[PDB]
Design a protein around this ligand. Structure first.
Ligand SMILES: NC(=O)c1ccc[n+]([C@@H]2O[C@H](COP(=O)([O-])OP(=O)(O)OC[C@H]3O[C@@H](n4cnc5c(N)ncnc54)[C@H](OP(=O)(O)O)[C@@H]3O)[C@@H](O)[C@H]2O)c1
Ligand SMILES: [Cl-]
Ligand SMILES: [Cl-]
Ligand code: NA
Length: 313
C-alpha cells in the first residue's frame, strides 16, 4: 500500500518539482493538498489528484494521510513540522529544514519520540552525478583537493542565505566532510525590504581545504561548483537543479590536457521522493540524513552569526 501523502502549502517548488514526482512514484499516493485558499488547493488537485483542503490543520487531522510534504517558507517550517509530527505523520520538509540548529534538534527529538521520519528534502543529494564526481576525485583525476567553490544565484523575483545559500553550503559538506568550520562571510542586506539578497562565505576543514560559497538573488541564474587540486581542476554546471532528462558534463583541466565526460541523466526529484517513501515503508530512517541536516543547520547559523552584514545603499 503506497504511502498516502498530504501537502501543506501550494508552493512553487511543490508544483514544479515535488508534486510531479509524488504523482508519478508508485510508492506514494497524493491524498490531500491544503492551502490558505481552497481555490489554490483545488487548482493543484486538478493537476495532481487528491482532495483540496482549506487550511493546514484540517489536512493534519485526516486519517488517510501517512506523511506530509512541507514546502512552506523557511520561517514557517518549524511550527508546521512540529504539528505534523505530533499528529503522527512522517514529514518531508523542504530545505532549509528550519532556521537554526537548536530548533532543528527539537524537531528531530519530537520525531524521535514517536518513531517518525523527518527528512530535509535536498533533492540534489539524490542525483548520482555527485557521487560520480566524488569517485573521479578519489581516483586522483586532479590530485589532492586544495580548495572548493560552489555558487547558486538567481534573478530578482527567507532571504538569500536560508533559501539559496544553503545549497552551496550543503555541497561543501557533501564533498569536504563533517569537520567544516566557518572562517568569514559577507551578507548584503537590502535596506528597502530588510532582506538578505546575496552573500559569500569562506569555510575551511581543519587541514585547510577551503570552500568559497557564493549565493544570491540579484544575479544571473547560475548553479555550479569547482575543485582545485594539486594537479588540476574539475568543474560542473547545473549542479543543483539539473533537469531529469539533462546529461551532466564533468570538465577537467590539467597541464596541457582537458577532458569532458558526459554522464547519464537522472531524475533527482523522483529519486529523493522515492528515498523518502522507501524509508517510511521500510522503517529504516538513515541516521546520516539527520546528522547531516544538523551539521548543515550549524554551519548556516555560524554563517548568519559570523558574517559581516552590509546594508545598502
Ligand atoms: N521555489 C523553489 O524552487 C525553491 C528554491 C530554493 C529554496 N526553496 C525552498 O522551498 C520552500 C518553499 O519555497 P518556494 O520558493 O516554493 O516558496 P512559495 O512558492 O512562496 O511557496 C510557499 C507556500 O507556502 C504557503 N504559505 C503559508 N503562509 C505563507 C505566507 N505567510 N507567505 C507566503 N506563503 C505562505 C503558500 O501556500 P498556500 O498559499 O497554498 O497556503 C505558498 O504557496 C522554502 O523552504 C524555500 O527555501 C524553494
Ligand atoms: Cl534540492
Ligand atoms: Cl557545460
Ligand atoms: Na552577523
Amino acid at each position: 500500500n503506497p504511502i498516502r501523502v498530504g501537502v501543506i502549502g501550494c508552493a512553487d517548488i511543490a508544483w514544479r518539482r515535488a508534486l510531479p514526482a509524488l504523482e508519478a512514484e508508485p510508492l506514494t499516493e497524493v491524498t490531500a493538498i491544503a492551502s490558505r485558499r481552497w481555490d489554490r488547493a483545488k487548482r493543484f488537485t486538478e493537476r495532481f489528484g487528491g482532495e483540496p483542503v482549506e487550511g493546514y490543520p484540517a489536512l493534519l487531522e485526516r486519517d488517510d494521510v501517512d506523511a506530509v510534504y512541507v514546502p512552506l517558507p523557511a520561517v514557517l517550517h518549524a511550527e508546521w513540522i512540529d504539528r505534523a509530527l505530533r499528529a503522527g505523520k512522517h514529514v518531508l520538509a523542504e530545505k532549509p529544514l528550519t532556521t537554526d540548529r537548536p530548533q532543528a534538534e527539537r524537531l528531530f527529538a519530537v520525531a524521535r519520540e514517536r518513531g517518525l521520519l523527518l527528512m530535509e528534502n535536498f533533492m540534489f543529494l539524490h542525483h548520482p552525478q555527485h557521487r560520480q564526481v566524488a569517485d573521479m576525485l578519489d581516483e586522483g583525476v586532479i590530485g589532492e583537493i586544495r580548495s572548493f567553490a560552489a555558487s547558486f544565484t538567481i534573478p530578482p523575483k527567507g532571504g538569500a542565505l536560508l533559501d539559496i545559500g544553503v545549497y552551496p553550503i550543503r555541497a561543501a559538506g557533501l564533498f569536504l566532510g563533517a569537520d567544516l568550520e566557518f572562517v568569514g562571510a559577507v551578507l548584503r542586506h537590502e535596506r528597502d525590504r530588510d532582506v538578505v539578497v546575496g552573500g559569500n562565505a569562506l569555510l575551511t576543514t581543519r587541514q585547510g581545504v577551503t570552500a568559497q560559497l557564493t549565493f544570491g538573488m540579484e544575479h544571473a541564474y547560475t548553479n555550479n561548483y569547482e575543485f582545485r587540486g594539486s594537479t588540476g581542476r574539475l568543474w560542473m554546471n547545473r549542479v543543483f537543479t539539473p533537469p531529469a532528462t539533462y546529461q551532466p558534463v564533468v570538465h577537467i583541466e590539467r597541464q596541457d590536457h582537458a577532458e569532458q565526460f558526459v554522464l547519464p541523466a537522472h531524475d533527482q526529484f523522483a529519486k529523493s521522493i522515492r528515498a523518502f517513501a522507501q524509508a517510511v515503508l521500510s522503517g529504516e530512517h538513515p541516521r546520516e540524513w539527520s546528522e547531516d541536516s544538523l551539521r548543515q543547520a550549524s554551519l548556516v547559523d555560524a554563517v548568519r552569526t559570523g558574517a559581516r552584514d552590509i546594508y545598502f545603499p
